[PDB]
Paper text:
The crystal type 2 contains one molecule per asymmetric unit. It corresponds to the Pre-powerstroke (PPS) state, a state with the lever arm up and able to dock to actin with electrostatic contacts. The resolution of the PPS state is poorer, but the electron density map is of good quality and allowed the entire motor domain to be built, including loops with good refinement statistics.
At the glideosome core is the single-headed class XIV myosin A (PfMyoA), and short and oriented filaments of a divergent actin (PfAct1). PfMyoA is a tailless myosin consisting only of a motor domain and light chain binding domain. By solving three structural states of the PfMyoA motor domain, corresponding to three states of the motor cycle, we show how the unique class XIV N-terminal heavy chain extension and its interactions with other structural elements define motor function.
Numbering used by the authors: 2 to 720, 727 to 768
The structure:
């Protein structure tokens, strides 16, 4: 389904640069000119398609062109349109012959759509946008990922012979890393479900493909067997995709030339704790629960006291079975994938005992009481007490101590303590927060246990970076988690434009700036409205959290007044008290605030942490390990969002250092169906992944760039301080290039996409 909002957002992107020169010099009009048009009942009746192909009929003027619809099959009726609505077509070409869009004569919106389409439906998804690699999602296994296809890339000697691929950007990066001994990073970008995880899995498998049979299994073995476990605990079924990464994945990898992983680092960030507690309908919790509850052996089941996937209140009993997902099979895989991380039969037994714990604690009914002369007072339900006692046993903590930290408010004046009781609402809020913590920190501990065996003896010098972020998400409900997810993405988009469209624009201005006709990404306007310390959505949520009386509406009002003067922040038209639109790269995204404060405050702290700290089980002790208690008033550092900004900014800054290798995934249709083309949903991504500009300004702009000394070296016969500047201009005028093809800069020689190719004989 394509929203009329997705239709609007895509219709804005529609731009007409080049003119339709479709008339024979004399007259009679050019004989059968293929063009594109926004006008046709075939565009009106269909939302999936935006343009039809037409043949320019003989006897039309440059005011109204009589055109007949060729593709899609037209009623054969010639209709008249203004040249304003006619784009130049890449008349008679074979989209399969060349694996780079750069070779296209015209690279207008309709032409890139038809080019990527005539490939996607032909089952060639990957194309080079230069630098970028556009990798569409065909939803079906193509088999162009296999060890056979891996070998074919790594071992094949010539780099030009190699067609566009994920493996193309894997060798491209691995070669530079070993050759120029500079640490390189692979950026995976697109929608939440466009192909990030898949490409990341593929490129990992590629670096795990060894030529030599010498290297130690241990490190590589554990790293690859981490991916299935990481997904069990870190991925869940969504309305957008049935395996959505609810954590941002980052890797640092030491891979020796002969395709072997010597060392690695696994860092996951920002887990979705609101997954474990509740799930949207049609949506689900983290795979692990389901896999466990199903494929658990007779004994585990009885020992833990496991029930059905329906019988656990934390897990939605309607959305339990995933369309085309066999949870028992994946569980079996997840169990071996754990052993293959140096986790013993006991270590596993514990992981699942805690998991069984979280579930069992989430079935405990808390109730209201008139108790201790407090009323509204927290008290565990009489019957559900047995549940709670095993629930704690399973987590390996004292039940009556967890019972004491929930149900009892503990305050301090001076060096002296004051008792008091927790209320039903707040006790339930705390009971939930215990589960959230246990889960988040167990996953984090498994990541820590993996890193303790895989990380380098010393540290990381030159490594291979890989980023499996959570892509842009749009629904009906858009919470703080959904806001964080879209903030993360916006950073990975400015990271890109600063490297791809800014270093360029600077170098032109530093030498010979040809066009003021360049980049289209005003990501700075939206990255500031969201992160800029003091004045931003996050900074007015940060301040509001540490405020005494801080309401969700109080935070909304501060943005609706302070950030008003900006176009990127738009307040809601209806229910303006709660909702607000943030005009993203992918377009207008609206957030219903509500709980925003408590969600940013959703982090376990206090004397409660200390209970888990001195647990009998060591894994449970280690579960928190490095934790600053404070037991009271919250800090700026302890805030969920405020920690995330620090986390993203720090990690992103390491990436800006390493060599950027961009992979751009496109989701062709929401329908989760192979070989289905929805032009508007795609067009939005062509704009956001900046693909339709990263070719407009690469082909229109100068692509060579070499200093006088570099240029004059290839023409050996010549050799000089200001004279060698004029020496280069000669070689060019002699070779045959027009004064438009080349440009002479303050220190270098710029040569166009087409020009630079001439001098290569
Ligand atoms: N190149 C591909 N070939 C086949 N299926 C793919 C491909 N890329 C993605 N998919 C499918 O699309 C699903 C959603 O993509 P996913 O791996 O979760 O990436 P992301 O991190 O963007 O969500 C995958 O689980 C897989 O079924
Ligand atoms: O769907 V994602 O794995 O990109 O979050
Ligand atoms: Mg993922």
């Amino acid at each position: 389904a394509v929203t009329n909002e997705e239709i609007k957002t895509a219709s804005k992107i529609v731009r007409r640069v080049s003119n339709v020169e479709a008339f024979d010099k004399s007259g009679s009009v050019f004989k059968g000119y293929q063009i594109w048009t926004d006008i046709s009942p075939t565009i009106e009746n269909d939302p999936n398609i935006m343009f039809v192909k037409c043949v320019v009929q003989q006897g039309s003027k440059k005011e109204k062109l009589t055109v007949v619809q060729i593709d899609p099959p037209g009623t054969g009726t010639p209709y008249d349109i203004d040249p304003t609505h006619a784009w130049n077509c890449n008349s008679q070409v074979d989209p399969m012959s060349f694996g780079d869009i750069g070779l296209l004569n015209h690279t207008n919106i309709p032409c890139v759509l038809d080019f990527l389409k005539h490939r996607y439906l032909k089952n060639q998804i990957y194309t080079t946008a230069v630098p970028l690699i556009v990798a569409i999602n065909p939803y079906k296994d193509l088999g162009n990922t296999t060890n056979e296809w891996i070998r074919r890339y790594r071992d094949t000697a010539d780099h030009t012979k190699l067609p566009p691929h994920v493996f193309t950007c894997a060798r491209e990066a691995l070669s530079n890393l070993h050759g120029v001994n500079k640490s390189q990073t692979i950026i995976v970008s697109g929608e939440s479900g466009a192909g990030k995880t898949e490409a990341t899995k593929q490129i990992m498998r590629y670096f795990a493909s060894s030529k030599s049979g010498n290297m130690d299994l241990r490190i590589q073995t554990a790293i690859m067997a981490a991916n299935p476990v990481l997904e069990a605990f870190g991925n869940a079924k969504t309305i957008r995709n049935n395996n959505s990464s609810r954590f941002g994945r980052f890797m640092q990898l030491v891979i020796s030339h002969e395709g072997g992983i010597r060392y690695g680092s696994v860092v996951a960030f920002l887990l979705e704790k609101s997954r474990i507690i509740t799930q949207d309908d049609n949506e689900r919790s983290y795979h692990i629960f389901y896999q466990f509850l199903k494929g658990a052996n007779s004994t585990m089941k009885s020992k833990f006291g496991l029930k059905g996937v329906t019988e656990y209140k934390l897990l939605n009993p309607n959305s339990t079975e995933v369309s085309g997902v066999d949870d028992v099979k994946d569980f079996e895989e997840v169990i071996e994938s754990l052993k293959n991380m140096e986790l013993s039969e006991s270590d596993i037994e514990v992981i699942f005992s805690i998991v069984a714990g979280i579930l069992t604690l989430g079935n405990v009914r808390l109730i209201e009481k008139q108790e201790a002369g407090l009323s509204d007072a927290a008290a565990i339900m009489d019957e559900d007490m047995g549940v709670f006692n095993k629930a704690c046993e399973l987590m390996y903590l004292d039940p009556e101590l967890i019972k004491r930290e929930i149900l009892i408010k503990v305050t301090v004046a001076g060096g002296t303590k004051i008792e008091g009781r927790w209320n039903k609402n707040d006790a339930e809020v705390l009971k939930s927060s215990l589960c959230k913590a246990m889960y988040e920190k167990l996953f984090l501990w498994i990541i820590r246990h993996l890193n303790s065996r895989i990380e380098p003896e010393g540290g990381f010098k030159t490594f291979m970076g890989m980023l499996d972020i959570f892509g842009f998400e749009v629904f009906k409900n858009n919470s703080l988690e959904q806001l964080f997810i879209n903030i993360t993405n916006e950073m990975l988009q400015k990271n890109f434009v600063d490297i791809v469209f800014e270093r360029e624009s600077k170098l032109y201005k530093d030498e010979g700036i040809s066009t003021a006709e360049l980049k289209y990404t005003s990501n700075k306007e939206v990255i500031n409205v969201l992160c800029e310390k003091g004045k931003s959505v996050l900074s007015y949520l940060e301040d509001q959290c540490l405020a005494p009386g801080g309401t969700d509406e109080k935070f909304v009002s501060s943005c609706a007044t302070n950030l008003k003067e900006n176009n990127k922040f738009t307040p809601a038209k209806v229910a303006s008290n709660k909702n607000f639109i943030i005009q993203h790269t992918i377009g207008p995204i609206q957030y219903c605030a509500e709980s925003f404060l408590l969600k940013n405050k959703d982090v376990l702290r206090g004397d409660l942490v200390e209970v888990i700290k001195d647990s009998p089980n060591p894994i449970v002790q280690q579960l928190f390990e490095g934790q600053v208690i404070e037991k009271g008033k919250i800090a700026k550092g302890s805030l969920i969002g405020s920690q995330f900004l620090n986390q993203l900014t720090s990690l992103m800054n390491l990436i800006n250092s390493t060599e950027p290798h961009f992979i751009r995934c496109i989701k062709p249709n929401e329908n989760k169906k192979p070989l289905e083309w929805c032009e508007p949903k795609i067009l939005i991504q062509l704009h956001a992944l900046s693909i339709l500009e990263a070719l407009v300004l690469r082909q229109l702009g100068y692509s060579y760039r070499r200093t006088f000394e570099e240029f004059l070296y290839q023409y050996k016969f010549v050799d000089s301080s200001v004279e060698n500047q004029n020496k280069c201009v000669n070689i060019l005028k002699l070779s045959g290039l027009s004064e438009s093809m080349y440009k002479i800069g303050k220190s270098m020689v710029f040569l166009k996409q087409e020009g630079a190719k001439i001098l290569t004989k």
